[PDB]
Protein: dipeptide binding protein
Amino acid sequence: KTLVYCSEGSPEGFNPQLFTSGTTYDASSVPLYNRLVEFKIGTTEVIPGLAEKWEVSEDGKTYTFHLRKGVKWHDNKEFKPTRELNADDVVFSFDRQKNAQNPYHKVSGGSYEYFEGMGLPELISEVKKVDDNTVQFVLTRPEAPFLADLAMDFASILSKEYADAMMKAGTPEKLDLNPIGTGPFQLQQYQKDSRIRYKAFDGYWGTKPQIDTLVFSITPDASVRYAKLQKNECQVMPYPNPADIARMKQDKSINLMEMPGLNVGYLSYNVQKKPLDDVKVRQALTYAVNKDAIIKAVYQGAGVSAKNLIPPTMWGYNDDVQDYTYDPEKAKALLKEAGLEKGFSIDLWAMPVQRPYNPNARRMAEMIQADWAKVGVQAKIVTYEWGEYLKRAKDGEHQTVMMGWTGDNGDPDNFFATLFSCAASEQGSNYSKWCYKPFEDLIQPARATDDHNKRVELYKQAQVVMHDQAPALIIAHSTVFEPVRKEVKGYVVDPLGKHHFENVSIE
Structure:
């Protein structure tokens, strides 16, 4: 049986270690790979994955994982596995990222964004191989969300054997381009920006998917995705156009699944691109934006005004924080104080794809542009292809960027740290390039304690600091709506933002 998913864009590549967008994860990590530990679909609960069981030392600095046996790897035209999963794979997967001496470290650019952004190089002291079926992680300090961290997409295990093969053949790039994983599906064919075909893996270690063939029909236009859904040319599609929600509810052939989101949408101010280095300027730009107008026009009831990086559905939300108000006058005032009465110019980057946290960045950009123009700030809206957009944003080419996030492990750390830490400002997703001690002083300790309450107090203070510093213009939290054809049985809306098709069965 064949199932066809209408994806929002093209995957950046096939090695989840190198990327950060969900677009790529849905086509790489999710269908083709596995992690030592995993999340039960639809929840944020860890479940054994490639690791059958594990133990944590009393000091909380040593995680010991027992790999399960009889785990087969996929077969490619250029490669056929001779052995099954072993500790050598796991060690390789992590060493590649941590160790600059590993041959593969610089392959494909060597941009281990998450690993580096999460400060893993300093956290992980060593990745030991106790024996062929037992791996050991020795940390420099205890990391509360570490177990969870390992269930994330970047922590996907790649094949050491296949890696060696391509190494000898003189074409290591193929490891990253022609994926061989242990996952339920296996890449069969990929036509750039058009279609991706996967076949169910027969030798999969777990429950084989009831779908014999999985096809991603890359359809970037939300209206077209809906079109295809109706004509049953697609059974599932993500990020429905807010206007279309109404219809979809009414449509009897469509089962519009809805669930509150674990996401944020915001504009990052590149804090080291003057005049954005001035808090006053950042605050001014924030006050000048009529946020409510945006929520109303763009989200149309599908989302709500946001004031914190963390959504209300997260266990750290500081509701005492009071959002900035739309106050053009105050904006003008601050701009005066900063010595910028005459105004200035900046670019505003907006992505060309729909995102769970931003239904139409394009239109949102125009509104912000217009608002800023009213206080004398001339903005140039700039947009590159989704992939390029992220690449350059990371390199810091922008002055202002539309961005957002969807929790990866249900832990506040994955939000505050991964997105606004100093480690993240250097090689991570902190596109605001903001690094501030007072913040670090809260965020870092909050990662070491097992005392959930101290964590809560810390993350709450963090939201204040962040508010005062205005490193980004927090825009909105969006509600998740996943349109699914009625013929599709067993679909579960993933709070972590993935689109899982193993468990699904169309008939």
